[PDB]
Symmetry: C2
Subunit: 240 residues, 2 copies
């Protein structure tokens, strides 16, 4: 029971904190999280993710508390803090550049081209297109970034993020692992819920049981292999 008319999209202003995550950015841009993107807690993320997307607490508590590590504060972050490389933020993003060779924070259209051009001849993105995109994005990083980090952990996060856009921006049952291109494109390009375009919050809860087989299938189809030491160590706090 949520009124989205009470949660209009507004462009972030100059001092509004935004991060590398289109999911949290979009929530902020609709006031499900504070529009200023600051002093955000895990409880706020849980509630916002539920209200906006029908994403459940299981994934948001797990991801949320890892994200809290990126700030210097006891129990909040600014959305921009999440750019901290090697906590959650990773190389071979769908819409951002690798931190060693560019901007790991802002939407980048040239990077997004690979996703935007995926699944030619359908009007949806799906599990096989998502996997191909992941394969191609990793190949790009391996080719152009000598400092690329690619581990079981980064690969899992990446597949989770692909599963997120397929499910949250779905038309049908998020189970189907497919989302209209016109919805997903608005999500990434404008960090807006495509309400005008016909999108509605899922009526099916999106949780780890639902996401898990989608994640695993994306990974499997992506023809993935580790790089280097394959160490799943995260950065535990900023400025260590």
């Amino acid at each position: 029971a949520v009124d989205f008319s009470a949660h209009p999209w507004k462009a972030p202003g100059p001092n509004d904190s935004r991060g590398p995550c289109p999911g949290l950015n979009t929530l902020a841009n609709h006031g499900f999280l504070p529009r200023n993107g600051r002093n955000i807690s895990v409880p706020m993320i849980v509630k916002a993710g539920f209200e906006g997307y029908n994403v459940q607490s299981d994934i948001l508590i797990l991801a949320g508390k890892v994200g809290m590590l990126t700030s210097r504060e006891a129990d909040t972050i600014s959305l921009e803090d999440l750019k901290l490389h090697g906590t959650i933020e990773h190389d071979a993003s769908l819409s951002r550049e690798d931190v060693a060779i560019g901007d790991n924070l802002h939407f980048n259209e040239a990077i997004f081209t690979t996703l935007a051009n995926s699944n030619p001849g359908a009007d949806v993105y799906n599990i096989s297109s998502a996997a191909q995109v992941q394969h191609d994005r990793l190949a790009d990083s391996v080719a152009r970034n000598p400092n690329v980090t690619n581990t079981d952990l980064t690969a899992t996060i990446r597949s989770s993020e692909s599963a997120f856009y397929l499910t949250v921006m779905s038309a049908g049952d998020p189970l189907r692992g497919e989302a209209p291109k016109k919805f997903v494109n608005v999500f990434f390009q404008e960090e807006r819920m495509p309400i005008k375009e016909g999108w509605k919050r899922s009526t099916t809860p999106i949780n780890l049981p639902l996401l898990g087989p989608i994640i695993d299938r994306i990974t499997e189809l992506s023809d993935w292999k580790p790089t280097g030491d394959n160490c799943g160590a995260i950065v535990l706090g900023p400025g260590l």
Copy 2:
């Protein structure tokens, strides 16, 4: 402001949650944290560690948020949750057994013997004794624990914990990196502030600048070296 006389030691009851950390347990046993050891946030830890020990927010925010990962809750833990092996809890503890070959949670006198017998002929523990104890405890784990984990991360946490007992249970300036045996022994064995015995909260702030060189010196004197997997990966949540 803070009145220690209003914070008497009381033994935990059977349903009071206690963890592998004598620092947090002691605070709970004095009501600086909830005596039941539950529903504890990073802000609560920050305030309790300041009031009880003069430990500053820098280290408590960093450690606190890593510890939050051990629970299934959005922003709190039970003290017992911190026993989760491979988040913070590690092998070659000073006063607990390795989880693969015993109890990683409760104080164990036989394990503590090594610490208790360190620095023979002085009435203090100090940086060189702390280092010897760490060397000997790791040797014990390598000898007796087929599942031993020893990484740069576990070694650093271990030196941090040793620096904690040398500083928080100090008589003089915590700078000196030495603490009376009679204070440290009560701290570990009873998880009590040794007020009766003459201990007072440090009047010098204990923060990362103060602890850093003590930690590094303990590590250096401990003659530590990597032994296998040196991947400093933490466990990101329970039930994975």
